[PDB]
Amino acid sequence: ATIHVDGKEYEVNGADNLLEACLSLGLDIPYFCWHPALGSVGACRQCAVKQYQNAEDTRGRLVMSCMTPASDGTFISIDDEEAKQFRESVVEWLMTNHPHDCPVCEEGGNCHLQDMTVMTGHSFRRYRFTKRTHRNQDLGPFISHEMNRCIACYRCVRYYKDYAGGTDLGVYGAHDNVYFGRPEDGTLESEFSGNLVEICPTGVFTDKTHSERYNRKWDMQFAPSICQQCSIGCNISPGERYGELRRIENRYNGTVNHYFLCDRGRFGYGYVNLKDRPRQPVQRRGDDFITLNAEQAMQGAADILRQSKKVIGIGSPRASVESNFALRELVGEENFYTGIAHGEQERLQLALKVLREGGIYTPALREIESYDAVLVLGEDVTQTGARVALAVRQAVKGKAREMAAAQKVADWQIAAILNIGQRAKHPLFVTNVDDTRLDDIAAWTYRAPVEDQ
C-alpha cells in the first residue's frame, strides 16, 4: 500500500493496521491496549492520529491507528496539534487516578506508562481531586498484584483468556472501578501466567521473585541466553546484579518464542543463586576436603587420570554441545557415554531419526500456530513442552481466524474474529494417560495407556 504520514510517503503492508505499520517504519505513536500478538481492540484510545480524506483535506478526523487499516493512498498525520493534544489528554486521564508510586514500584525504569507519559510530553498535573484506590490480591508465589497502578487497558485479560486460554483472570466491575484479577485470592493457574509481567504496561503484575532481590533495569547486566529448563529452546535475557542472577526476561525470537515464555523458564532460575553450589575445585583427602585453585586441580587430576588404566566419561543432556564434546575428547569416543538410560536413548534416537530422516518438515515454534489440525500422541505438552501447548492453542484459534478472513475482516481486528468464530475451532486430538491441560480446547481426548495410544 501507500500511506502519507506528515507529508512523507511510505510503502506499508495493506493488511496491517496503521499503528503497527507506522511503528514498523520507525514512527512513534503512543499505545497501551494494542499488542502485536493480541490484535487490536481500541480500548485505551491512546494511538490517535488524524486521518484526512484525501491530499487536499484540511479538517481531518481523529482515528485510532490500531483500528484503522493501512489501505492504499491513506493520508494521516501523527504530529498534528489536535492529535498530540488528544494523546496528551489520554495520558492525563490515565494519570488522574495513578498512584504516587514510581520509587517503590518494580516497573520503574521499565514502565511503558512512564515512557508514554514522557513521550506525549505530559508533565504538569492540574487534576486536584481524590484518586481511586484498590485492594490487591495474592496471586501466588510468582506474580505480585498492585491494582492501583492499572490503566484499564485489558491487555492482561486478553492475553490470559483469549491468547493463553486461562480461565481464572477476568475483569470485574464497572464504569471506572474496573478491577483485573482473579475472582478470589489464590495462585494463578496458567502455565503462562508469568508473561503478565511483560504484557501489563504498568506495575500491576510484577515478578515477585525479582521483587524479593530487586534492582532497576539500568543496573542489570544482561546477556542473550537459552532457557535451560526444557527442550524447546526459548530465548531469554538473564539479568544479574551483584553476582547473582536477578531476573529472566523474555528475549524476542520471531522464529521460536516470540513474546512469551512459560513459568518454568521464567521463574525456575533460582538454582543459580543457591549457596551450596561448588565455587572452587575440591579434592578429598581421607575425610578432609582440600580446596584447590585451577592449576593445582588440573595437575592433580591429570596425574591421577594418567595413572589410571581406563577413564570413561558420562555426559548429560543438561550440558552444552561443547562440554559434552570436550568430555568425549578427554576420554575418547569409545569411552564416552551419554548419561541417560538405554530406553531413554532409544526413544531419543528414534525421535532424531524421524526428525532428520523422515522426510517431513519439523516446524519452528512460531510456525506451529499456522497448522490446521493437531494430533498429540502421548506427550503431555503443557507440563513438558509448554510453549508448544501455547502455539497449539493459537493453531486451534486459526479456524476462527480463517472464518473471519472469509468475511473480509482484517486479521488484527481480534474482537470481530472471536465474534465470528464463536466456538468453532480447528481439530485437536490429544492422547495421554490422564487428563491434559489441553482438554478444554481439544476436539477429543484419549485417556489410555501408552500401548493403547
Partner: protein, 226 residues
C-alpha cells in the same frame, strides 16, 4: 560433521559492529566505583571476555539498527519497557531485524522412512504388577527447576495416582499413604484418586523427590497400604 551447523549459530569472538563489541549492560549502568567498594576501594579490572563477542561493560553496541541477531536486551531512547522490542524487528510482531538467531542443523530429507510394522498389543493389567504412568509437572519435573527455592511453595505434594477400582481393590481411600518397593526401596506416598487413569496403571510424578523419569513405563511391585 552432523554438528557442523553450530558454527553459524552465532558469530565468533572477533565479530564487531563498526569496530566495537556488543554491550551486556545499559549505558546508564550505575555504581561502577562503589559496587565493590566494601571489598576494596580500588576498582578491579573489567572482566575480559575472550570467548564471545560481548563485553562485560557498557562500552559496546546495542543499537536496534545494528547488523546482528544476538540482542542482550531491548532498549531504545524513549522506549524503556519490553515494548522496546518494536525497534529491534524488521516489522513489529515479525522476525528480528537481520534475522532471528539460531540455525537448523538438518534440512528436511528427500525421502522418508518406512512404516513401522511393530504394532504393540493391547495393555493387559496383570495382578501384582503395576505399570507406572508418568505424570509430569511444569513445576517439579525439571531437576534444576526443583532446586529453585521459589518452586518449593509452588510444586504440589507428591501424590500417587490410583484408579477408583484399583484403590477399591486395595481398600485405599484418597489420602491414605501407601508404600511401594522399587529397586529394593520401600517409599510411601499419599494416594490421589485419578478417574481418567486406566485400571492396572499407577500414576507417579516424574522427576520429583525420589521418583526418577526413568521409572516412566516401568513396572511396580508390592504396592500395599503403609
Amino acid at each position: 560433521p552432523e554438528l557442523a551447523g553450530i558454527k553459524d549459530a552465532a558469530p565468533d569472538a572477533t565479530f564487531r559492529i563498526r569496530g566495537q563489541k556488543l554491550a551486556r549492560e545499559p549505558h546508564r549502568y550505575s555504581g561502577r566505583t562503589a559496587m565493590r567498594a566494601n571489598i576494596s576501594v580500588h576498582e578491579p579490572r573489567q572482566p575480559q571476555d575472550i570467548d564471545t563477542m560481548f563485553t562485560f561493560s557498557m562500552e559496546g553496541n546495542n543499537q536496534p539498527t545494528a547488523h546482528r541477531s544476538q540482542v542482550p536486551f531491548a532498549w531504545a531512547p524513549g522506549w524503556n519497557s519490553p515494548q522496546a522490542w518494536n525497534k529491534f524487528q524488521d516489522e513489529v510482531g515479525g522476525k528480528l531485524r537481520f534475522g532471528d538467531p539460531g540455525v537448523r542443523l538438518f534440512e528436511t530429507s528427500e525421502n522418508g522412512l518406512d512404516y513401522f510394522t511393530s504394532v504393540p498389543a493391547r495393555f493387559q493389567p496383570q495382578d501384582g504388577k503395576w505399570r507406572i504412568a508418568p505424570y509430569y509437572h511444569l513445576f517439579g519435573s525439571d531437576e534444576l527447576s526443583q532446586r529453585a527455592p521459589v518452586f518449593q511453595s509452588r510444586m504440589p505434594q507428591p501424590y500417587i495416582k490410583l484408579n477408583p477400582a484399583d484403590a477399591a481393590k486395595l481398600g485405599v481411600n484418597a489420602g491414605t499413604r501407601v508404600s511401594f518397593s522399587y529397586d529394593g526401596n520401600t517409599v510411601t506416598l499419599p494416594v490421589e484418586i485419578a478417574e481418567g487413569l486406566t485400571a492396572g496403571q499407577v500414576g507417579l510424578p516424574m522427576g520429583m523427590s525420589g521418583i526418577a523419569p526413568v521409572l516412566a513405563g516401568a513396572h511396580l511391585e508390592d504396592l500395599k497400604e503403609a
